[PDB]
Design an enzyme around this catalytic site. Sequence first.
Site, PDB file in Angstrom:
ATOM      1  N   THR A 254      -2.261   9.488  -3.805  1.00  0.00           N
ATOM      2  CA  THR A 254      -1.304   9.552  -2.704  1.00  0.00           C
ATOM      3  C   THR A 254       0.123   9.371  -3.207  1.00  0.00           C
ATOM      4  O   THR A 254       1.036  10.101  -2.802  1.00  0.00           O
ATOM      5  CB  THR A 254      -1.643   8.491  -1.655  1.00  0.00           C
ATOM      6  OG1 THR A 254      -2.989   8.678  -1.199  1.00  0.00           O
ATOM      7  CG2 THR A 254      -0.693   8.585  -0.469  1.00  0.00           C
ATOM      8  N   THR A 255       0.336   8.399  -4.094  1.00  0.00           N
ATOM      9  CA  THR A 255       1.664   8.137  -4.633  1.00  0.00           C
ATOM     10  C   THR A 255       1.934   8.888  -5.929  1.00  0.00           C
ATOM     11  O   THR A 255       3.097   9.169  -6.241  1.00  0.00           O
ATOM     12  CB  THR A 255       1.852   6.636  -4.877  1.00  0.00           C
ATOM     13  OG1 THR A 255       0.835   6.163  -5.769  1.00  0.00           O
ATOM     14  CG2 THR A 255       1.776   5.867  -3.567  1.00  0.00           C
TER      15      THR A 255
ATOM     16  N   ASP B 173     -14.606   5.073   1.006  1.00  0.00           N
ATOM     17  CA  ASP B 173     -13.815   5.146  -0.222  1.00  0.00           C
ATOM     18  C   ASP B 173     -14.704   5.431  -1.432  1.00  0.00           C
ATOM     19  O   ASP B 173     -14.377   6.275  -2.278  1.00  0.00           O
ATOM     20  CB  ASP B 173     -13.039   3.842  -0.418  1.00  0.00           C
ATOM     21  CG  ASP B 173     -12.089   3.900  -1.599  1.00  0.00           C
ATOM     22  OD1 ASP B 173     -11.962   4.981  -2.214  1.00  0.00           O
ATOM     23  OD2 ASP B 173     -11.466   2.864  -1.912  1.00  0.00           O
TER      24      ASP B 173
ATOM     25  N   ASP C 156       0.841  -1.189   0.000  1.00  0.00           N
ATOM     26  CA  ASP C 156       0.000   0.000   0.000  1.00  0.00           C
ATOM     27  C   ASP C 156       0.880   1.244   0.000  1.00  0.00           C
ATOM     28  O   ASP C 156       1.747   1.399   0.867  1.00  0.00           O
ATOM     29  CB  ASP C 156      -0.928  -0.006   1.213  1.00  0.00           C
ATOM     30  CG  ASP C 156      -1.811   1.222   1.278  1.00  0.00           C
ATOM     31  OD1 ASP C 156      -2.697   1.367   0.409  1.00  0.00           O
ATOM     32  OD2 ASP C 156      -1.622   2.042   2.200  1.00  0.00           O
TER      33      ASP C 156
END
Lengths: 534, 518, 543
Positions: B81-82, B386, B48
């Site tokens: 996020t990444t 989510d 994750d």
Amino acid sequence: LLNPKAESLRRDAALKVNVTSAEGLQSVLETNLGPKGTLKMLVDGAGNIKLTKDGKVLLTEMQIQSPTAVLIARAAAAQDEITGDGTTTVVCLVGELLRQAHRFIQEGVHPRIITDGFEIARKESMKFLDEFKISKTNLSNDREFLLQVARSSLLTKVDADLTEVLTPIVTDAVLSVYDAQADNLDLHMVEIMQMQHLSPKDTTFIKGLVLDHGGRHPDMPTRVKNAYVLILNVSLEYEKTEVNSGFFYSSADQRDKLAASERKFVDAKLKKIIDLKNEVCGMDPDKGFVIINQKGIDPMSLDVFAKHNILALRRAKRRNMERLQLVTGGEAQNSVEDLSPQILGFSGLVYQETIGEEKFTYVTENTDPKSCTILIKGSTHYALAQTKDAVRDGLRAVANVLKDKNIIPGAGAFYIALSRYLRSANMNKLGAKGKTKTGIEAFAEALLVIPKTLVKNSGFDPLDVLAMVEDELDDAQDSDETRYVGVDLNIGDSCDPTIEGIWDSYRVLRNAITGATGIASNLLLCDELLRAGR
Amino acid sequence: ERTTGRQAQISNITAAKAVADVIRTCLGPKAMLKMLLDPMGGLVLTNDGHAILREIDVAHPAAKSMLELSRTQDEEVGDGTTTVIILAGEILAQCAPYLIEKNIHPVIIIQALKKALTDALEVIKQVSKPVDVENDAAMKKLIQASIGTKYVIHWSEKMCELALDAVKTVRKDLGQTVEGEPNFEIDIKRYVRVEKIPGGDVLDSRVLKGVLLNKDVVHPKMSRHIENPRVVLLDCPLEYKKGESQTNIEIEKEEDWNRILQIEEEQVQLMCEQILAVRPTLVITEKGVSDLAQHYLLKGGCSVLRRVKKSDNNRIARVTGATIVNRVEDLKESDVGTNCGLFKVEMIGDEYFSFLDNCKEPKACTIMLRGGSKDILNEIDRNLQDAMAVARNVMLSPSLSPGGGATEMAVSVKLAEKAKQLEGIQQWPYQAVADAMECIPRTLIQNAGGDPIRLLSQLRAKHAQGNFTTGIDGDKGKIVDMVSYGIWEPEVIKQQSVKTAIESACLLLRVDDIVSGV
Amino acid sequence: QNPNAGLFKQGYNSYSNADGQIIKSIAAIRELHQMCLTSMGPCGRNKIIVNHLGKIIITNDAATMLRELDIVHPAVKVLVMATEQQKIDMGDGTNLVMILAGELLNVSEKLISMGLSAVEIIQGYNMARKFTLKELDEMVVGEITDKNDKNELLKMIKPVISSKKYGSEDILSELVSEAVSHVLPVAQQAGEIPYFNVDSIRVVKIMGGSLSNSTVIKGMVFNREPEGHVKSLSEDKKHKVAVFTCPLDIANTETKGTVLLHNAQEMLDFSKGEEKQIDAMMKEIADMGVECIVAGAGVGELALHYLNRYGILVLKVPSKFELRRLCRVCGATPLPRLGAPTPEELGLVETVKTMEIGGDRVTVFKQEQGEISRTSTIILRGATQNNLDDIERAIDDGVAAVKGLMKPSGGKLLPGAGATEIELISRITKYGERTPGLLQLAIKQFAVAFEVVPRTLAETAGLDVNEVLPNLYAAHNVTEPGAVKTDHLYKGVDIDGESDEGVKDIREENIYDMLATKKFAINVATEAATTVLSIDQIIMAKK
């Protein structure tokens, strides 16, 4: 591109480290696979030495430094909580799969391709497992098959001499608790006990329960036939005046008189107990009377009981009383005043065993105890531990076989057959693409590790044994007949597992294959190693 | 202590690159796993991105700032996020040679980065495709992407409907030239929290157009259903009150102790009359309420709720409009919370309820979730959070952009084409941004096991000569049409990722030295 | 303690691409690439190199620096050999070849870092080379018509001298043109028949004065003392000149023939013999009309006395090259024997005199009406030896370049000062964009490699590259109100140095480069870059 107090692996260093750790773990657990394997010696540093062969115990007790090895051991330990066996198989499969994956990666194969091939091969192996299993019958006269299963389970853990003792014990213990009916199986109905200063071969099976506490009077009968079991929660020890009192005297004679006067309280209850004993089969032939008396008993009351041919115990554990409530059928009497024949149970021969350090009592031979006890006997701690582990493993294996009627012949037949089936079907289908053939071949080759390791442990050459097995399988296929071909670790040639009596559990193989594939996929997908928290 | 010259910029760029390279492999369904090794013997193989960026310790301040940015974006936006860190690191790496080799001042690079941000946003708007935010079928199909292939795959069918209904209840679609575009003012964290009701099934879950209160009637002889409810909020308790300074009670005769009770009755009666002056139907007091106060309020024909946390009143004031007054004597007639729907307390699953819904748009709601077990309820709550984040991202802009790196490749191509015509020293940073945009397709190709060079070249050629809907297939790893394969991502996520990455790169480039100070 | 695995050849120096040697070779070449980057351009600078003899060498020529520098790495040797080939074949453009090869290797390093295989890089470089060579044919703006006039020659001479001696191009170009005009034949518009040779012009320097005092001589010049009583001849036309290799003394046999005077008898006999033989030989030479005698060896006392008696000019030329030049100028044949004034071997020089230049007297053999000489001499004057050496190098480069004005693209002119480089950059970028496949990256990098020339010109001139480069790009990439580009498309890279904005047009100063030089330099640089890049492992054996 790094931070202080941290270390990381770049490029393919992480893959090499993981592969090396997996190979090391496999070599650690390679030698203990199969009945021809060896035993590991563990030292805790406090003077206790454990000689164990079971993979789960070895992994749990042994300390592991390599983080990848720790992860592999923890993942393989799940077999114990699911099937109870196959940890060594999981470790070997993971090791060989990682070896093959690394070999292919050195040729430029991306890890994801290998993972996809492993998943496809896992699906094909599940299909092969479904098509390859044998359905066990529900006949109540299957005791022979249970004996074969117990022998197969035990030979892996014992020296092949205690097998003759443990196989019938395990078979009978498992069969007695689970009658020939749907109902359910619970191994908690089988008690495990250990005794010292005895030969390892003395291990025997007890139909009922065994009590730790014994008699404390020489006149009590050694054996009681058809005894009525009485459970009493009222203490029979010396009782004092119910109201405030004391012993103030100038000579001990007054104290003795006061004690004799106060003893009437216990004497009254003893009178009721003796009356109950006399009323219920007091003089009937082939009848007896046994009292448990959870609470303590004064020596005078013990002598009174002994003089009436009554075998009375004392100071027994509450768990033992609860077990006796079902084993013997008797009830615990809270008050002697309400004592009545209905409280009395019934049991077979009651025997007291005298040991140099302790004295046991047997309450076995019950009409329907709904339980049984296995007495592990040995002279050394390691021998007792090995016997207990073997007994538990056999019990779990037989329970799994009974609950799950799906049975697969062992002796390495399943692994070789699965490898051949994969090599054929996956190459003939090519359902994903050609690039997955590398992973398919890697998985197929890795699935052959188990028979090779077994042959290596048995001392024979794996090449010749595998060649003979393959030749026999090819002949069977050319004959258009269904045949199971395994490996004979005693002769070295091929053998039929369904005739010799070697079987493996469907759940064990399924879970081992799934866990090995998952661990291999997880480790092969590790791109780099990161360190943090320091 | 002190760093001067290009050394500080080099250090910051190296820290950013080190941070980016770790998660470079966290994109796409084929994302590789990573090993996190603690100083102890424990370790995990989590893949994750948020976990990797959270459990990784970085000493360089720039890396800490990047991690904080990613953590903030993890909550500000539902995805990226990444992506933000990877894009920022790639942009910084591409701009590094200009600052080091070409001797370009940081100000020029920052200005060019801002202009490239504007151009990239324009290109993202150009390449995006519209979606039907009013048709429930399209919204369900789109939101099923973030719900399926998960623990809630079994109930996906009703999960999509529940999430969409909640988002629409909190969504306010308004457009005018007087108040402007509210941007739907969607708030999931505060006014969409899911209420877990044991029992039932997911299909039984319902969306409440208001606030659900778990406080039952404080007295059995109290109305449980009002067809014309009106809520009044107060803080001061309804009980015996003492003086501001030290108060002492002196009683001579034992029977005289009833004087305190009489004073309490008088004060409570006065306060209850003041409360009732506004024609209330339900009285909510944050502090304790005495039994006498409950009796007096019941005499007025209204319900009473005591010891209610401020969290309930904060949402009640939003869905009912009731105004809270600290002192009872200062209560005003206009503070009564009119326009309230109902006070129905129908019990579901052996649980107490109090519905304060209505047919208005207070930008607040409550999700009445049902399930067969606590674990199912918690997993469904997380998946609904989510899914609602994804739905909020989709609905905030009725359009979506192609996934699989197609948007990034198109942005890079258009940025290069535009930079070719700028005719200025700033052209170099524009080309650096265009090249750095190629990070996403490179990561997708690498994770898919394909050729990192030939596949990227083919994709770039297809974008230059063909359509911008071509991307990298997650499973096949070849160049395919995203629309045909149904690979898409919300435009809001792409815009936010690009904006945040470029702004972070500019901010990092601004810092030219780190000095000790307290 | 550390184990060594994978090594089986030898413990001697060995490099393989497994450790990134493909980039290490480029890094090693960069050491001299940086050295040569400071030489190209009109504002180039020399460097101080100490010779093995303890002398100080200062020059602006990169090839001379490479020759005077120690080469160890084979990769550097490849570029050194390429530069030598460029100098030998073309005579100019060594800096172009070296810098282009260095930049090609530098961009190849970036390509390798990107992950592109060396094979694709080489293929793309070859394609880009072919495209650039074909495009250079269409980049021609002007052309030399080969009129052999000084005005047309200066057009090519001036740019050649620039970047070799900055600030003096105006005078050096005039000197070179004057020297060339003295040797060029009467012909025009003929590029297939060679007429001009590199050795046709000699360069000499005399200490004292400044460059403004330099002159040009229409014949051979000897800088050695005559060593005789005769200093110069009259102005009578067609002076017969005799060339000898044997020293002017008594004639003897080939074997032995040594004359030694030990006693009175031998003294008298040898004195009489020497006197009679020398007198007879000198009288015979004079009777034929020989007014000057040139000997490759020394002259005896009696020989000097008899030469003075007959008024024969005395000169010694120990240098055989000078004797060959004199023979070419006058047509005389060297005489291995003495007293053999054969008319078929005697030469003719219209005027022979001793001239004083800056205080130093030299002997000049020049032709006026008959037997017109095909060689000329350039005399440099200056008080600084370094400046004189730089001027000599510039003159040599100009003379070499002049020989290149023949048919094979010699007369074709390209816009210099980087304008051609920018046009090639744009064209190659467009071609790479059109070119499909991975070759596009290599084509784009090949185009980028040409950006060095404007960058080098801007840096050497002290101009800010960050402003010049975008200005150059805008100037060469313009949008006009029509389908055909117009206006000033020939803008180059200016050096300014005092005050200016943007850049100046080439036509303002007529800065043009030879098409053949640029084309051959590009070809050689690409070949060297491919050769260096094609090496991914170096294996050598210890001596």
